[PDB]
From a paper:
We refer to this region as the alpha epitope region (α-ctCSP) as it consists of an α-helix that includes the T-cell epitope Th2R (region III), and the so-called CS flap, which contains another T-cell epitope Th3R. Furthermore, all α-ctCSP-binding Fabs share a similar feature of utilizing CDR H3 to insert into the conserved hydrophobic core between the α-helix and CS flap in the αTSR domain. Interestingly, α-ctCSP-binding antibodies 234, 236, and 352 exhibit a moderate level of somatic hypermutation (SHM) with some mutations in residues in CDRs H1 and H2 that contribute to epitope binding. For Fabs 234, 236, 352, 1488, and 1710, the heavy chain buried surface area (BSA) ranges from 401 to 519 Å2 (representing on average 73% total BSA) and contributes more to the binding interaction than the light chain (151 to 187 Å2, on average 27% total BSA). In contrast to the promiscuity in the mAb234 binding to the Th2R helix, the interactions with that region seem to be critical for mAbs 352 and 1488 as these two antibodies only bind the H18 haplotype (besides 3D7), which has no mutations in Th2R except for L327I in the perimeter. One explanation for this intolerance for Th2R mutations is that mAb352 and 1488 have tighter interacting surfaces that would clash with e.g., the N321K mutation, which is present in most haplotypes. For haplotypes H36 and H92, which do not have N321K mutation, we suspect that changes in residues 317 and 318 may disrupt the binding of ctCSP to mAb352 and 1488, although it is difficult to specify how this happens without determining structures of these antibody-peptide complexes (changes in residues 317 and 318 do not seem to obviously clash with the antibody surface).
Here, we expressed and characterized seven monoclonal antibodies to the C-terminal domain of CSP (ctCSP) from volunteers immunized with RTS,S/AS01. We determined crystal structures of five Fabs to elucidate how these antibodies recognize their cognate epitopes on the ctCSP or αTSR domain (residues 310–375 of P. falciparum 3D7 CSP). Competition and crystal structure studies indicated that the antibodies target two different sites on opposite faces of ctCSP.
Residue numbers in the entry:
A (entry chain H): 1 to 52, 52A, 53 to 82, 82A, 82B, 82C, 83 to 100, 100A, ...
B (entry chain E): 311 to 371
C (entry chain L): 1 to 9, 11 to 95, 95A, 96 to 106, 106A, 107 to 208
Write the structure that this text describes.
């Protein structure tokens, strides 16, 4: 019987602006301090701004000071956050949180959050580079070759090896989402060090969003 | 009676906090009674400054 | 603003009791709160004002705040408690402040140290006036690692982008770390190292031009 539903998350260019909403129901909105809390991917929570019951008292984290402006509409029971001149570090899941406590304060109720993603990113095929096996393990029983699939957008990418014939030692890693908004990932297969020079190893990268297919031969250098 | 205990107790009775004095924090010992200074009785309860809007007085037990 | 510092990871077996610490000099004088954030969902306030619980939170969750250490104890831990836990303070004299977060892990397997592999820039990537070092971490448990980079002997923090640890088919965790260099900085130094810390211990791999 208390819910907080945020809206307004999307993609924006660096230096652009966005405005988030939080629609509150099930509690007399006009007599509660509201907050915004954001969380970059894989990182911790960060308080951003708070506005008091009426709007007399307003503060911001130094991170967003000057660029963000929090506001509330106590007639429609809504909270807003106008975010200007957005940078990459602003990318995060934004939550609206209800404040409670007088002298020492907490956040008792939270919405599910809305994702804000600031990127100069457009559909882009990957650059596929070979990751040749290290000459220290070339003499032994096993070596690790691979492929680097760099700077592409959007997901996904498909990686295979020798056209589905090599699956045993294959480890294709989850992609990293860079500050730039593009993706990168690697795919490594473990092979017997004896087969280097006799067996050929090709990674088959296919990025359908860009109608880009790359089969890159990986040789020991 | 520490400033910590006074602050935590205020959140304990937040719905009850009023212009009149509160129940004494304690049943065994010493604590504090708190009230909203008459001058601040029409102030929202989330906007109340702990020092200048809250009257505090110790209670012996 | 008051700074809070929590351990990155904390592991324990089912039915045992786990303690998640939140440290700060004279933190006992502040009133701490605690949140549970399971993957994908919103935080949930489990404990406020040091030790009081909201309605519905089970008795298993308990908070204390003594001197330089606040502690959220979780008794008879269940798998469902696997989440991230953030301590938080906000005295009305300053602004709010969160800890770094602690990843609780309820152990269903024996702890495993990570396997690391570091690849230097490819001659074909140097071709395009670029250089990317690829450090691949795999087969560790719990899913919590710190990755650090070190050129020659000093730390590097610009150009680094690291992933979330993600479960694999074997139920252990994987993560990758990419350090973007210019071809000049590459041949600049004599060494470049990927240092991966996990459960107090470290594995470090080195490559040289």
């Amino acid at each position: 019987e208390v819910q907080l539903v945020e809206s307004g998350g999307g993609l924006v260019k660096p230096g652009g602006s966005l405005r988030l909403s939080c629609a509150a129901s099930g509690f007399s909105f006009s007599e509660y301090r509201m907050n915004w809390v954001r969380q970059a991917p894989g990182k911790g929570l960060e308080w951003v701004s708070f506005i008091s019951s009426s709007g007399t008292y307003i503060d911001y984290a130094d991170s967003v000071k000057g660029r963000f402006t929090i506001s509330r509409d106590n007639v429609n029971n809504s909270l807003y956050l106008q975010m200007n001149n957005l940078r990459a570090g602003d990318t995060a899941v934004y939550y609206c949180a209800r404040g409670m406590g007088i002298a020492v304060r907490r956040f008792d109720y939270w919405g599910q959050g809305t994702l804000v993603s600031v990127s100069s990113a457009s559909t882009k095929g990957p650059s596929v580079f070979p990751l040749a096996p290290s000459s220290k393990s070339t003499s032994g029983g096993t070596a690790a070759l691979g492929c680097l699939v760099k700077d592409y957008f959007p997901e996904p990418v498909t990686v295979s090896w020798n056209s589905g014939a090599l699956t045993s030692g294959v480890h294709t890693f989850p992609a990293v989402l860079q500050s730039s908004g593009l993706y990168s990932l690697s795919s490594v297969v473990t092979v017997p060090s004896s087969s280097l020079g006799t067996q050929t190893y090709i990674c088959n990268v296919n990025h359908k969003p860009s109608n880009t297919k790359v089969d890159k031969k990986v040789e020991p250098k | 009676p520490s400033d910590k205990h006074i602050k935590e107790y205020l959140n304990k009775i937040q719905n009850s906090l009023s212009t009149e004095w509160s129940p004494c924090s304690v049943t065994c010992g010493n604590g504090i009674q708190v009230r909203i200074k008459p001058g601040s009785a029409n102030k929202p309860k989330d906007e109340l400054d702990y020092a200048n809007d809250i009257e505090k007085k110790i209670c012996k037990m | 603003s008051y700074v809070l510092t929590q351990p990155p990871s904390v592991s324990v077996a089912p039915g045992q009791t786990a303690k998640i610490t939140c440290g700060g000099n004279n933190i006992g004088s502040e009133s701490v709160h605690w949140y549970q954030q399971k993957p994908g969902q919103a935080p949930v306030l489990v404990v406020y004002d040091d030790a009081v619980r909201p309605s519905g939170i089970p008795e298993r969750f308990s908070g204390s705040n003594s001197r330089n250490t606040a502690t959220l104890t979780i008794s008879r831990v269940e798998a469902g408690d696997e989440a991230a836990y953030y301590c938080q303070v906000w005295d009305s004299s300053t602004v709010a402040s969160f800890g770094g977060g602690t990843k609780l892990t309820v152990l269903g397997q024996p702890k495993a140290a990570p396997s690391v592999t570091l690849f230097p820039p490819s001659s074909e990537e140097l071709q395009a006036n670029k250089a990317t070092l690829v450090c691949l971490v795999s087969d560790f448990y719990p899913g919590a690692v710190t990755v650090a980079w070190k050129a020659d002997g000093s730390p590097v923090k610009v150009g680094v982008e690291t992933t979330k640890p993600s479960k694999q088919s074997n139920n252990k965790y994987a993560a990758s770390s990419y350090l973007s260099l210019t071809p000049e900085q590459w041949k600049s130094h004599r060494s470049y190292s990927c240092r991966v810390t996990h459960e107090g211990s470290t594995v470090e791999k080195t490559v040289a031009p």
